[PDB]
Amino acid sequence: MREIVHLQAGQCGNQIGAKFWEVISDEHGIDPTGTYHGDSDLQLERINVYYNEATGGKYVPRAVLVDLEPGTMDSVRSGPFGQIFRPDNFVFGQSGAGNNWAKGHYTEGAELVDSVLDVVRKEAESCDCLQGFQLTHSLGGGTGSGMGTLLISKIREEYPDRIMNTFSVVPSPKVSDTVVEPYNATLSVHQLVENTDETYCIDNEALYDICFRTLKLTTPTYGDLNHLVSATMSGVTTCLRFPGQLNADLRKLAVNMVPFPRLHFFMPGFAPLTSRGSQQYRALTVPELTQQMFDAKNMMAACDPRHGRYLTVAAVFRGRMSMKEVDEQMLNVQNKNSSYFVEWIPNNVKTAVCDIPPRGLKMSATFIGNSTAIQELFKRISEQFTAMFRRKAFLHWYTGEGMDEMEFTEAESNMNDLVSEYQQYQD
Amino acid sequence: MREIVHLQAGQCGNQIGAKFWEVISDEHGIDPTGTYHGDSDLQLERINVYYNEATGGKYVPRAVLVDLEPGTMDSVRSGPFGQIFRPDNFVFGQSGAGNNWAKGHYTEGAELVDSVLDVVRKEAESCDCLQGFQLTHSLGGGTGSGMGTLLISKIREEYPDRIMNTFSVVPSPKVSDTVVEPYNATLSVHQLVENTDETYCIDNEALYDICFRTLKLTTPTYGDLNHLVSATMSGVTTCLRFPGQLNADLRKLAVNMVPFPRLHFFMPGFAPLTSRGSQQYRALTVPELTQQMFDAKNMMAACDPRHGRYLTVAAVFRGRMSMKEVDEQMLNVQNKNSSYFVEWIPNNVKTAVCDIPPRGLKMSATFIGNSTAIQELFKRISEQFTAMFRRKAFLHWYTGEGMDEMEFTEAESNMNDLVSEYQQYQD
Amino acid sequence: NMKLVGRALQDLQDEADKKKQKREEMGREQKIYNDYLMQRREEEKAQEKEL
Amino acid sequence: MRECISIHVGQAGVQIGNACWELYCLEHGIQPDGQMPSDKTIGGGDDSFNTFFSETGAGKHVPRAVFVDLEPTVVDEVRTGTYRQLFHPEQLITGKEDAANNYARGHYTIGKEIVDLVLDRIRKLADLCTGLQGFLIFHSFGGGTGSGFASLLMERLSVDYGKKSKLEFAIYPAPQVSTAVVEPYNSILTTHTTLEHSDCAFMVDNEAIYDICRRNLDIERPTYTNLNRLIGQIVSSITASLRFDGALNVDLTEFQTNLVPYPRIHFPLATYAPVISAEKAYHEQLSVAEITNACFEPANQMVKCDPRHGKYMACCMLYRGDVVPKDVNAAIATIKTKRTIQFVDWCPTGFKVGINYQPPTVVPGGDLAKVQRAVCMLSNTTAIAEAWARLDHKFDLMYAKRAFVHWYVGEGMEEGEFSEAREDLAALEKDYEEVGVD
Amino acid sequence: EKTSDYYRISEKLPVRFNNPGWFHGYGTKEAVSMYRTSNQTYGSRAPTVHEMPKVFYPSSNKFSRQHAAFGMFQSHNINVTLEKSLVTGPDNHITHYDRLNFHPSYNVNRPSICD
Ligand SMILES: Nc1nc2c(ncn2[C@@H]2O[C@H](COP(=O)(O)OP(=O)(O)OP(=O)(O)O)[C@@H](O)[C@H]2O)c(=O)[nH]1
Numbered sequence A, B: 001m002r003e004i005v006h007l008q009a010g011q012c013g014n015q016i017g018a019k020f021w022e023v024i025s026d027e028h029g030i031d032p033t034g035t036y037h038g039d040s041d042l043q044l045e046r047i048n049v050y051y052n053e054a055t056g057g058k059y060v061p062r063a064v065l066v067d068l069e070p071g072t073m074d075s076v077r078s079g080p081f082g083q084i085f086r087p088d089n090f091v092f093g094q095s096g097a098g099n100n101w102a103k104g105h106y107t108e109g110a111e112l113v114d115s116v117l118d119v120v121r122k123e124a125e126s127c128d129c130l131q132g133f134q135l136t137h138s139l140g141g142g143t144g145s146g147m148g149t150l151l152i153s154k155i156r157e158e159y160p161d162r163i164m165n166t167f168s169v170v171p172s173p174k175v176s177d178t179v180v181e182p183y184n185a186t187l188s189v190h191q192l193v194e195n196t197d198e199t200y201c202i203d204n205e206a207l208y209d210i211c212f213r214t215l216k217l218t219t220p221t222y223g224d225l226n227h228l229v230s231a232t233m234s235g236v237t238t239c240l241r242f243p244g245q246l247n248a249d250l251r252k253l254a255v256n257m258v259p260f261p262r263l264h265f266f267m268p269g270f271a272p273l274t275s276r277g278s279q280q281y282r283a284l285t286v287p288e289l290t291q292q293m294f295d296a297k298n299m300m301a302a303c304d305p306r307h308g309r310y311l312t313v314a315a316v317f318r319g320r321m322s323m324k325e326v327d328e329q330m331l332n333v334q335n336k337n338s339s340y341f342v343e344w345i346p347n348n349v350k351t352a353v354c355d356i357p358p359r360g361l362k363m364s365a366t367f368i369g370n371s372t373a374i375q376e377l378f379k380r381i382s383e384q385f386t387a388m389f390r391r392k393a394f395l396h397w398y399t400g401e402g403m404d405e406m407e408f409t410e411a412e413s414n415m416n417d418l419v420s421e422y423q424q425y426q427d
Numbered sequence C: 001n002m003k004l005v006g007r008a009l010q011d012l013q014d015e016a017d018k019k020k021q022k023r024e025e026m027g028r029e030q031k032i033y034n035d036y037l038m039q040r041r042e043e044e045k046a047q048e049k050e051l
Numbered sequence D: 001m002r003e004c005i006s007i008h009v010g011q012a013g014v015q016i017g018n019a020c021w022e023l024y025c026l027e028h029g030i031q032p033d034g035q036m037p038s039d040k041t042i043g044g045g046d047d048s049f050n051t052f053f054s055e056t057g058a059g060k061h062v063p064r065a066v067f068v069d070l071e072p073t074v075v076d077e078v079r080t081g082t083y084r085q086l087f088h089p090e091q092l093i094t095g096k097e098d099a100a101n102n103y104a105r106g107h108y109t110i111g112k113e114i115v116d117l118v119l120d121r122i123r124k125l126a127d128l129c130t131g132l133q134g135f136l137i138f139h140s141f142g143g144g145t146g147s148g149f150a151s152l153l154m155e156r157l158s159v160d161y162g163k164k165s166k167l168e169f170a171i172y173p174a175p176q177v178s179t180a181v182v183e184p185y186n187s188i189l190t191t192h193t194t195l196e197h198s199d200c201a202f203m204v205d206n207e208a209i210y211d212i213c214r215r216n217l218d219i220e221r222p223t224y225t226n227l228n229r230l231i232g233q234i235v236s237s238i239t240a241s242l243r244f245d246g247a248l249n250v251d252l253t254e255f256q257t258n259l260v261p262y263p264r265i266h267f268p269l270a271t272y273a274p275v276i277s278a279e280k281a282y283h284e285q286l287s288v289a290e291i292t293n294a295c296f297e298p299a300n301q302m303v304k305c306d307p308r309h310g311k312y313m314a315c316c317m318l319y320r321g322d323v324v325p326k327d328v329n330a331a332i333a334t335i336k337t338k339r340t341i342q343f344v345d346w347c348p349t350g351f352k353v354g355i356n357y358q359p360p361t362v363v364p365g366g367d368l369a370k371v372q373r374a375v376c377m378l379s380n381t382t383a384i385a386e387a388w389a390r391l392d393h394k395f396d397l398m399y400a401k402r403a404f405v406h407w408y409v410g411e412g413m414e415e416g417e418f419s420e421a422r423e424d425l426a427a428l429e430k431d432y433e434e435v436g437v438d
Numbered sequence E: 001e002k003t004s005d006y007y008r009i010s011e012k013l014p015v016r017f018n019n020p021g022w023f024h025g026y027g028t029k030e031a032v033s034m035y036r037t038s039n040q041t042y043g044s045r046a047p048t049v050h051e052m053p054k055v056f057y058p059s060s061n062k063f064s065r066q067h068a069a070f071g072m073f074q075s076h077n078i079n080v081t082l083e084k085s086l087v088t089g090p091d092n093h094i095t096h097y098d099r100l101n102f103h104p105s106y107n108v109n110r111p112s113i114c115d
């Protein structure tokens, strides 16, 4: 059978995967200790898609934790489910990050690339055959981008037949905290577009905005932010592990999703988000959720695609639905904004219906989109890159590591190519 | 099916809408909590004309509350039926209007028109197919006039196929409290006559006298006055929601009421108003109600059309009547004053009978009138406008906002055109 | 549907006790630490005199 | 793991060190004996102290610091003080002769025979350490013993250990107060020697520290106790990231990478926002917004520089206590919209946020406030060149009339080393306007 | 003398900061003499219950070293592996190669590999 291997990378992915994983076990009903309390047959049936069997009915997460900083890992190990994570799966190094990309890309990675290759291939042999792998990391995160670029480069050659799913977060456009982030972003995206097949683009600013919009709690935890994005990544995975007439394979999606090879940047979309008085008030129906599904405010990934147009759209529906309501809902939105799609392709909508509801609500839905709204993203970093590279500031560290001006040239040159291509196809 | 969505605008409409909504809530027997107590099937069947269904048998008011002052929204929220009103529908601004027409029409409106359109189009998408919309506001009410003139203009190009119902109160002819009122009204009415199709004329001085005439209770509250106008506004809406052999559509009515485009200003009329001993001193019969409905004192809109003549008249009768009496009542009034009608159109009377009596009284009615009594209304403001524009008093505010005296020119010019139009047709 | 509403209702009913309770000890911890400081203040003033 | 070594050169640098571990022992609850109560925190030298202390199987929290001094006076009563039993005897490196404020005397005459013993200490400290991220250097520019003796050792620890961080801290000389007129001499004697080796130097000035005392702390007669308790909290705040955790945690290396833009210039400015009396925080309220406006108010900085006469490059805010990103990211967003704040166009971002949920605690018998939200402001601007500009005109007069030279040349020195530093300084200013000019 | 009495607590604070009466090595508030050196004021007062921190959150590293002990895992192992089939049937076993590896059902007219 076909499964998925997870990689928990960067210090953000350390929060990401941790909240990502605990949602899964609680969804399936495994206790924090690990002794699964058998309550749903189907989740008992299709649990080997992600977990293996240990002695006494504990289910081992088939994931790898990689970092450099023990304190974060100690916090992860002391988390609600660190006991269900394996010490065998905890890989790290003795050095401190400094979150220099080159250090984790050329110097620090050099002595850990072998070991991380060791643990994955054993676990790759521990399991039988994959769909592929998914990776939690960040594009602007110092160590996560540094470690990931090597692995995705290294994972590609020996297994060029599987799915290289990646999950990276875009730092806040207004401020990236660290000044070196645009260097890290520009350096990373070069090999990312080269090596990857699918990327999820996530920004924290919209997470704060949606907190103001429907969460309305003023002060949530970043884990509460993780609670939302994990729910999105939960939904995309509900297809594979759960039955119901919806074609689950990501390749079944990806071939329907990507028209041309260089398109890897995709945006999430999620369903009912509810505020204080509306929980007892929302007349939960197919029409209202679909409207809320396709809301510019319900967008959380990068920015409003109102500026551009829609290339490919695909929404997965979780709960007790029927094939008809999604049909006329598609027709309703088909005629609602017919012009806002691209004339190149009609009927670029792909709908999947997961019959089994989640635990806590029945009608939920996840949306994956590839629109023309990424231009605003990388043009911004273009002025950042050009301006910061206008006078090569902060560059002395990288030269000592063994870097020169040259790699920056083709990287932006490669970066400029995708910029023109995005406008070229749509505009 | 055909429905109607309401707009609550201006700080007077803030009092007006709640009372009118509380009238609707009680007339159909819904508790202040919202759990409708099924007692009348006809009101059970025909609540979807104004209210949608939320879970728990609670009927959502499909209206929008818009203002700038939170305390007014707080007061109506803390009202007996504010819990039936929606924080979803509570749109308000971070600005003080100053009760300046231009501020709410150009500066404050700019950042507020965006959100209110989203709500109403969401409300438009929430329901299926409208008859149109109705708006409560005041022509002399600055926050109401400033927004209302903006919104009516926008909804014209959005849905030019529906009813643009407007409910505005004329300021007191003797004193307008606010001194820039004729400036505000002249500005608003220019856009009002352009964008509207139906308007009701209301003046509080006439309402004040009615209390001296029939209420006779010396000291009422303004909310009591809201009960009076809401009963009229409710009465004209009973025909839509209730069964019985009478044609209810405003399009049924308006084409019967509108001979030519410039007739949008109409005066209401109501049925038995009863005093201290007359409740048990009246033998309720159509002829005596036919008398009191056509009484020079019973009118409440602007003033006595005794000075002028009648163009079109329409009366809706609510209770257990027959077409025969209103027919012979129609003949009696036809010959009672045949000369006072206009020779242009004979048989300009249009009658409807609602077989469903109100809750509290059995035989009632409502009247809507189109006569020659508005000339003195806009003559009055004309000398006011000319006198104040004689030396441009209180103008530096409007000049600073970005306005010019030129806009005032075609403004009064348009009314002067309307002055002759009403004058020429009858005189 | 009713169970969903039942689940929906109870969640809203909660989180109000959390907000209200935090406020009191905030006042309590304020007042308790307030009284300590006057006791502290009179202490140094007491200390000054024998000096 | 996450540990470092503190070095305290100069009898000026020793009281300021003395306050630190007194404070440090407080949040850790360390008894002067070096032992905890009957409860269990002992081991192989491993708990919250392990990053600072060494409470080995001997069960006594051994500070990971060496105190070096040249006058035996001050180092002796502290050896008879309160925590002297905690202190290692010959880590309290004493001296029998002074430098006579002479930078060269403390660099040539006696520093040779002493550094080797100290070099024995550094290797004996280095071997026991495991992570050893770097060092904590407390000194003074105008040091009677801080200036000269440190310059040799920092050179010597650089040549053998050039792969780890060295954090320099010194009281910057008072711009208009001069307790010594040889103080200018040794100052740029230190800088020109340290410019090509020092990693990150942080400077403060005592005059504005006093100015704060009677501005908002309302103390017209403070003492070193207040002065050191102030700066002791400063290093405590920057070390809380090591001591506690937070929403995000940042190490000294990231500060190194993100604060200094370019080589040579590595001289940022610190600041701690909730400087207020107990009675003022009493009936008032603290939140991120006002402490953010206050922390960027020019008069709240301890260095006599006008930010309106300079331009900002880097800013590191380290919010210690109960805070949330929401208001913080919004409050800083308002700051970016501010017009008086003039960052250079080169850096779109210059803000280094560090969150630590632990509220800073008060010191027993102290004078600070009771704070839940505190932030430390590490920033660098171009308003600093005036200080060296204030320096150079002081020298070009005195050097021309070559006062006091007989003292230095009498003990074996010459003017070339005095000649080299002025253009090195002149190079230092000229670098500032070139990076100042966009 | 008990901290939880006067203030709330995180309920995981060490008994050190829950019991401040055990700090016996501090200054004994000696009567100040005419010879009162300023330097001795440093740490001259024992803290009270109110000086105790409200919350405590150490950087625990027990699991790290007990995992970071020795060396870190590396594959010098024999790369043993079994190639699996493209079918889930515990009876059929066919790969990219050897596609004729399955149970042959029982035909009645045409014998094995008739063509
Ligand atoms: N875990 C976590 N990460 C965050 C949070 N907020 C922002 N991030 C970002 O997530 C990014 C990715 O983490 P990593 O790739 O592990 O970061 P790194 O390589 O160690 O280097 P840095 O980016 O400097 O931390 C970081 O750069 C942070 O900027 C948060 O609240 N939790």
Ligand SMILES: Nc1nc2c(ncn2[C@@H]2O[C@H](COP(=O)(O)OP(=O)(O)OP(=O)(O)O)[C@@H](O)[C@H]2O)c(=O)[nH]1
Binding pocket: B009, B010, B011, B012, B013, B014, B015, B016, B097, B098, B099, B100, B137, B138, B140, B141, B142, B143, B144, B145, B146, B177, B178, B222
């Ligand atoms: N609610 C309410 N409005 C009244 C009452 N009496 C007169 N009005 C008038 O109704 C008008 C309409 O209210 P709005 O349109 O909301 O007025 P506004 O735009 O906020 O500004 P102003 O008209 O200057 O008050 C106001 O101008 C009042 O002058 C009353 O008793 N209650």
Ligand SMILES: Nc1nc2c(ncn2[C@@H]2O[C@H](COP(=O)(O)OP(=O)(O)OP(=O)(O)O)[C@@H](O)[C@H]2O)c(=O)[nH]1
Binding pocket: D009, D010, D011, D012, D013, D014, D015, D016, D071, D098, D101, D139, D140, D142, D143, D144, D145, D146, D147, D171, D179, D180, D224
């Ligand atoms: N760091 C520190 N500086 C102090 C203190 N008290 C005064 N100062 C200032 O710091 C300077 C001390 O430098 P030096 O006098 O050269 O100190 P030193 O090199 O250790 O040797 P001495 O001259 O004997 O003190 C003085 O000029 C004072 O202005 C203190 O307690 N600590």
